[PDB]
RNA sequence: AGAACUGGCGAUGCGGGAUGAACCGAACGUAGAGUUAAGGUGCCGGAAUACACGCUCAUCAGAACAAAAGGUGUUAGUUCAUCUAGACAGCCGGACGGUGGCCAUGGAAGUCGGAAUCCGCUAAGGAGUGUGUAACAACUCACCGGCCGAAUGAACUA
RNA sequence: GCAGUCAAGCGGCGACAUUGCUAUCAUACCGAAGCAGAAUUCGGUAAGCGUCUACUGAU
C-alpha cells in the first residue's frame, strides 16, 4: 500500500556553513527505502547535489487529520512519456491523500500508461469550497442529494451450478 | 444538336422535383462519407489527398489572414 | 466583446447631453427607415443595443433602471415632448409584411407574376406549382404568408414609431 | 464525460403502447402523473446518450401520430407517355415500359391533378411507403416520376 | 574484409519460453521430507474464471517495419479567446445611403474579365462568401437586434 | 538529381506543395461526364462464369 513520508535535505555542511538550505520536501511511497530513493532522484534533477554528497537526517510519516472526511483533492502532476515532459493537473475525490494518490497512479497507468518511474508528484491540496472543481466528472458528485441506482449487479457463487438462474435486480 | 440543348431543357423544365433536396442531402453526407472512407494501397492515396487538401486550405487561410 | 463597452460609454456620456430620455418600442424595421428617422433631426439621437447591456448601463441615476427595461429602442432628445410625440404618432411608413402582422391578395390559378397579378404586370412555398415547358403556373393568404407577401413586394405593414415611457434627465 | 444520470399512456417493459400504436424498444420510465413520462439512463456512455434521445423522439412521434396523424402527400407528372396508376397499387404505361410495377390508407386526391395522398397513424409506416413509392439515361432529362410534395399532418 | 576486449557453447546436463544452439534460472552421488527461479494459474496443463482503476469491439483487435498522416472513432489533459453586459446551437429579424464604386463589351447593377476597395451611419454590414441574372432581382455568408439559460468555441498533447 | 518563396519540429538541418529540358479486358444492382438517344470512358463491386502420403475404375 502507498504511504506518505517527509524527507529533508542538508547536503553535508562545508566549513562555516552548517545546515545548508534545509531542503525539505514530501514524498509518496510504500516503504522507507523507496521514499528515500525517490527523494534522491528528485534532488538529482531539481538541483545539482549528488546523493554521495547528500545525507538523510530523518524520515517521518504524515497521516491524515480526518481519514473519515470526504475531500476533493487537487493534484498537480509532472510526468514524461514517449514525448517531452509536460505538467498536468487533475482533481480526485477521495477521503485521504494516500488513497487519492493511489487512484491517481492507477488512472495514470490506465489512460496514460505511466508508472511510478515516470510520475512525479508536484503538490496535493484540498479544495475548500464548491464550484472550484474544474473537472465536470468530479463536480458531478457534488450535486444536492445525489441518488443513483446500480443496475445489472454481478454475483459469484462457490458452486459451479445453479437451478434458479437468478436475476441481476439491484 | 443545338448549342444549348441541355441548357434549353433545364431552363424549360428545371430539374427533378427533389433534385435540390437530394443534392443537399448528398453534400451533407460528405462529412460522414469522408470519415468512413478514411478508416476503410488506396488508404495511402486517400491520406495523401486529405493531407494535401488540408495543407492547401491552411495556407490559403493564413495568407489571406494578413488582410486583418 | 469590446463593442459592448462602446455602447456603455456612449450611453453613459449622452445621458446628460440631452434634456429628455425616451424609450421607443421598435425591434423590426428596415434600416433605411431607421436612418431616415435618425437624420430627420439633429437635436435628438437614436440609441439602440442589447436590452441587458442597457439595463446594466441604465444605479447611474435615480429610477433610471425602471423604464430602461422598456427600451431595445432608446431615444435621447432635447426637443419638447409635444413635437416628438406628434411626429411619432403622425409619422408612418408602409414597410414589408412581417410574420402574423390584411389585404385580399390572391395568387391567380394561371401564370404567376412578380406582383401576383394584382396590377393590370410582368410575368415571371409548398403550393402545387408546376413548369409548363418554360412557364410557371388559385391561392390566398388571408409565417409563410409574410414570406409570400414579401416575394411579391407587398408592403402592407403600416409600421408607426411609438413611445412607451417618460423619464426626466434632471428630475426622473 | 462519464455520465451518471440523464433525462393515455403507460410504461412497462420495452413493449410500449400509446392511445392506437405500439412499438418495441435499455432505459427506464416512470408514470409519475400519466401526463409526463420520465426517461432515465444510468452509467451510460456515448452510445447511451444517443440511444436515450432517440427513444424520446420516437415516443413523441408516436404520440403526435395518434393524436394528429401524418399524411405524406405525393404527386407525379408526365410529358409524353401518360402515367397510369390504379388502386393494391399499380403503375403502368410510364415511358412505355411494358414491365408493370406493383406496390403493397392509400387513395387519390381530388381537385389536384395527378396527385396521390398517403395517410396513416404510424409515421414510420407512412414514411416507408412514401419512400418505396418514390424509389420506383440522363438524370436531368426526365422530370417525370413520383415524388413527395409535403409531409403534412392528417389534421392540417 | 581486417581487427583490440570480455561472457556462454566448445566439453554442458535439468526447469520454462507448446516447437528449436545463440534466451532466463540453474551446472549434476542414489534417496525421503518442505520452500523457490525462470515460466505459470479456463481447458489440453499440475496452479485463484483472485481483488481495484479505467482503457478497446478490430469487416480475422489483443495475448522485425511502412509509422509521415487521416477518423464528424473513443478515453483524459496544455494553450488562446468568448463567459451570467446572458455559453454554442436552434429560430425570427436587421443585413442600409452615395452605388449601376473605375474600363471595353449588346450585357457585367458584387459573384464572365483588370485593379483599388473610397465611405456616411448605426446595435450592425464586404463596392460583397455563395446559390443565383441574357441583363435585374431574391435568399444568404462574417457582421449585428429578440427568445432561450452557462459554460463554451479553436489548435495540440497521452 | 540540379537551385529555390519553400518550414511542424529544431543544432545549421528539416516528409508538405509549386518554378526550367530530359489487384477484371467483357459478364453490373450503383454514381459522374456538355450522358438530347445508341455508343462511350471514368470511381464501383466481385477471380462467379467468360477470355512413402493421392486414387483416377475396385473388393
What does this structure look like?
Chain C: It comes from Saccharomyces cerevisiae (strain ATCC 204508 / S288c). Chain C: Belongs to the universal ribosomal protein uL10 family. Chain C: GO terms for molecular function: large ribosomal subunit rRNA binding. Chain C: This is Ribosome assembly factor MRT4. Chain C: Its main location: nucleus. This is part of a larger assembly, with chains A (170 residues), B (68 residues), C (172 residues) and D (156 residues). Chain A is of the alpha+beta class and 170 residues long. Chain A is built from three helices and six strands; from the N terminus they run E-E-H-E-E-E-H-E-H. Chain A has two domains: 1-67, Ubiquitin-like (UB roll); 68-144, Ubiquitin-like (UB roll). Chain B is extended. Helices cover 30% and strands 19% of the residues of chain C. Chain C contains six helices and ten strands. Chain C has helices at residues 2-14, 31-39, 51-57, 64-68, 81-90, 144-151; strands at residues 20-24, 44-47, 74-77, 93-95, 106-107, 131-132, 135-136, 139-140, 157-159, 163-168. In chain C, helix 1 packs across helix 3. Chain D is built from two helices and twelve strands. Chain D folds into two domains: 1-69, Ribosomal protein L6 (Outer Surface Protein A, domain 3, Alpha-Beta Complex), CATH 3.90.930.12; 70-156, Alpha-Beta Complex (Outer Surface Protein A, domain 3), CATH 3.90.930. Chain D is elongated. Chain D is of the alpha+beta class and 156 residues long. The chains are: A alpha+beta (170), B mainly alpha (68), C alpha+beta (172), D alpha+beta (156). Chains A and D meet through loops of A and loops of D.
Provide the fold topology:
This is part of a larger assembly, with chains A (170 residues), B (68 residues), C (172 residues) and D (156 residues).
Chain A: E1 3-9, E2 23-29, H1 32-46, E3 59-61, E4 71-79, E5 86-94, H2 97-112, E6 119-126, H3 136-139
Antiparallel strand pairs in A: 1-2, 1-3, 4-5, 4-6
Chain B: H1 5-13, H2 19-38, H3 42-65
Chain D: E1 5-6, E2 15-18, E3 21-24, E4 28-31, E5 37-42, H1 46-67, E6 70-77, E7 84-86, E8 89-92, E9 101-103, E10 106-108, E11 115-120, H2 123-135, E12 145-150
Antiparallel strand pairs in D: 1-5, 2-3, 4-5, 6-11, 6-12, 7-8, 8-9, 10-11
Chain C binds 2 RNA strands through residues 1, 3-8, 27-32, 34-35, 38-39, 46-57, 72, 98-99, 114, 143, 150-151.
PDB class: ribosome
Keywords: ribosomal assembly state, ribosome
Entry title: Nog1-TAP associated immature ribosomal particle population F from S. cerevisiae
Amino acid at each position: 500500500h502507498f504511504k506518505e513520508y517527509q524527507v529533508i535535505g542538508r547536503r553535508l555542511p562545508t566549513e562555516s556553513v552548517p545546515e545548508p538550505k534545509l531542503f525539505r520536501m514530501r514524498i509518496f511511497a510504500s516503504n522507507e527505502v523507496i521514499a528515500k530513493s525517490r527523494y534522491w532522484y528528485f534532488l538529482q534533477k531539481l538541483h545539482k547535489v549528488k546523493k554521495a554528497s547528500g545525507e538523510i537526517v530523518s524520515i517521518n510519516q504524515i497521516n491524515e487529520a480526518h481519514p473519515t472526511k470526504v475531500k476533493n483533492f487537487g493534484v498537480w502532476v509532472r510526468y514524461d512519456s514517449r514525448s517531452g515532459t509536460h505538467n498536468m493537473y487533475k482533481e480526485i475525490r477521495d477521503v485521504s491523500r494516500v488513497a487519492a494518490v493511489e487512484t491517481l497512479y492507477q488512472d495514470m497507468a490506465a489512460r496514460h500508461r505511466a508508472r511510478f518511474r515516470s510520475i512525479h508528484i508536484l503538490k496535493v491540496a484540498e479544495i475548500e469550497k464548491t464550484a472550484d472543481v474544474k473537472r465536470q466528472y468530479v463536480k458531478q458528485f457534488l450535486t444536492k442529494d445525489l441518488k443513483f441506482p446500480l443496475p445489472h449487479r454481478v454475483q459469484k457463487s462457490t458452486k459451479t451450478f445453479s437451478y434458479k438462474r437468478p436475476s441481476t435486480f439491484y | 444538336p443545338q448549342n444549348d440543348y441541355i441548357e434549353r431543357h433545364i431552363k424549360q423544365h428545371g430539374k427533378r422535383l427533389d433534385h435540390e433536396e437530394r443534392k443537399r442531402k448528398r453534400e451533407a453526407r460528405e462529412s460522414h462519407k469522408i470519415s468512413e472512407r478514411a478508416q476503410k494501397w488506396k488508404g495511402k492515396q486517400f491520406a495523401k489527398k486529405r493531407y494535401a487538401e488540408k495543407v492547401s486550405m491552411r495556407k490559403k487561410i493564413k495568407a489571406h489572414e494578413q488582410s486583418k | 466583446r469590446e463593442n459592448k463597452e462602446r455602447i456603455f460609454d456612449e450611453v453613459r456620456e449622452a445621458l446628460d447631453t440631452y434634456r429628455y430620455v425616451w424609450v421607443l418600442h421598435l425591434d423590426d424595421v428596415r434600416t433605411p427607415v431607421l436612418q431616415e428617422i435618425r437624420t430627420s433631426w439633429a437635436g435628438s439621437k437614436l440609441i439602440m443595443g442589447k436590452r441587458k447591456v442597457l439595463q446594466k448601463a441604465l444605479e447611474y441615476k435615480e429610477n433610471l433602471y425602471q423604464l430602461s427595461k422598456l427600451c431595445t429602442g432608446l431615444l435621447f432628445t432635447d426637443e419638447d415632448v409635444n413635437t416628438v410625440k406628434e411626429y411619432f404618432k403622425s409619422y408612418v411608413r408602409s414597410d414589408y409584411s412581417r410574420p402574423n402582422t390584411p389585404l385580399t391578395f390572391t395568387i391567380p390559378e394561371g401564370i404567376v407574376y412578380s406582383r401576383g397579378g394584382q396590377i393590370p404586370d410582368v410575368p415571371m412555398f409548398e403550393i402545387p406549382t408546376k413548369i409548363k415547358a418554360g412557364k410557371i403556373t388559385p391561392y390566398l393568404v388571408c409565417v409563410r404568408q409574410a414570406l409570400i407577401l414579401k416575394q411579391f413586394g407587398i408592403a402592407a405593414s403600416e409600421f408607426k414609431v411609438k413611445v412607451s415611457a417618460y423619464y426626466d434627465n434632471d428630475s426622473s | 464525460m462519464k455520465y451518471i444520470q440523464t433525462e393515455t399512456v403507460s410504461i412497462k417493459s420495452r413493449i410500449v403502447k400509446v392511445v392506437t400504436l405500439t412499438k418495441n424498444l435499455d432505459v427506464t420510465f416512470t408514470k409519475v402523473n400519466n401526463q409526463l413520462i420520465k426517461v432515465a439512463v444510468h452509467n451510460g456512455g456515448r452510445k447511451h446518450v444517443a440511444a436515450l434521445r432517440t427513444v424520446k423522439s420516437l415516443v413523441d412521434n408516436m404520440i403526435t401520430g395518434v393524436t394528429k396523424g401524418y399524411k405524406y402527400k405525393m404527386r407525379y407528372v408526365y410529358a409524353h407517355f401518360p402515367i397510369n396508376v390504379n388502386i393494391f397499387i399499380e403503375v403502368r404505361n410510364f415511358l412505355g415500359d411494358k414491365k408493370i410495377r406493383n406496390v403493397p390508407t392509400i387513395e387519390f386526391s381530388t381537385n389536384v391533378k395527378d396527385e396521390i395522398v398517403l395517410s396513416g397513424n404510424s409515421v414510420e409506416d407512412v414514411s416507408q411507403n412514401a419512400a418505396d413509392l418514390q424509389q420506383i439515361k440522363d438524370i436531368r432529362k426526365f422530370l417525370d416520376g413520383i415524388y413527395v410534395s409535403h409531409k403534412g399532418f392528417i389534421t392540417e
